[PDB]
UniProtKB/Swiss-Prot annotation:
Whole sequence portion shown: 487 to 554 of 636
Protein name as it appears in the record: Tumor protein p73
Species of origin: Homo sapiens
Subunit structure: Found in a complex with p53/TP53 and CABLES1. The C-terminal oligomerization domain binds to the ABL1 tyrosine kinase SH3 domain. Interacts with HECW2. Isoform Beta interacts homotypically and with p53/TP53, whereas isoform Alpha does not. Isoform Gamma interacts homotypically and with all p73 isoforms. Isoform Delta interacts with isoform Gamma, isoform Alpha, and homotypically. Isoforms Alpha and Beta interact with HIPK2. Isoform Alpha interacts with RANBP9. Isoform Beta interacts with WWOX. Interacts (via SAM domain) with FBXO45 (via B30.2/SPRY domain). (Microbial infection) Interacts with Epstein-Barr virus protein EBNA6; this interaction inhibits TP73-mediated apoptotic pathway.
Impact upon substituting residue 1 to A: Loss of interaction with WWOX
Subcellular location: Nucleus; Cytoplasm
Its job: Participates in the apoptotic response to DNA damage. Isoforms containing the transactivation domain are pro-apoptotic, isoforms lacking the domain are anti-apoptotic and block the function of p53 and transactivating p73 isoforms. May be a tumor suppressor protein. Is an activator of FOXJ1 expression. It is an essential factor for the positive regulation of lung ciliated cell differentiation.
Record family assignment: Belongs to the p53 family.
Post-translational modification: Phosphorylation by PLK1 and PLK3 inhibits the transcription regulator activity and pro-apoptotic function. Higher levels of phosphorylation seen in the brain from patients with Huntington disease.
Gene: TP73
Linked pathology: Ciliary dyskinesia, primary, 47, and lissencephaly: A form of primary ciliary dyskinesia, a disorder characterized by abnormalities of motile cilia. Respiratory infections leading to chronic inflammation and bronchiectasis are recurrent, due to defects in the respiratory cilia. CILD47 is an autosomal recessive form characterized by onset soon after birth or in early childhood.
Tissue-specific expression: Expressed in striatal neurons of patients with Huntington disease (at protein level). Brain, kidney, placenta, colon, heart, liver, spleen, skeletal muscle, prostate, thymus and pancreas. Highly expressed in fetal tissue. Expressed in the respiratory epithelium.
The SAM domain, residue ranges: 1-65
């Protein structure tokens, strides 16, 4: 789809301005890769538990949806 902004601004915006690097190491560049991801898998990456839950709750937001 030529570039995918809907992912970077969110990943970092979630509060992980220096965590995406550790996440990208696996494949957290395409939100499609974090469509199902959870806190469960979050702690799997082995990334410092600085915003683990934050990222999860933020990921679930996608699945949830904000409309009316």
């Amino acid at each position: 789809y030529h570039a995918d902004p809907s992912l970077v601004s969110f990943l970092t915006g979630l509060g992980c301005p220096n965590c995406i690097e550790y996440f990208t190491s696996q494949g957290l560049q395409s939100i499609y890769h974090l469509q199902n991801l959870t806190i469960e898998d979050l702690g799997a990456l082995k990334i410092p538990e600085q915003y683990r839950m934050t990222i999860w709750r933020g990921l679930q937001d996608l699945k949830q949806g904000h409309d009316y």
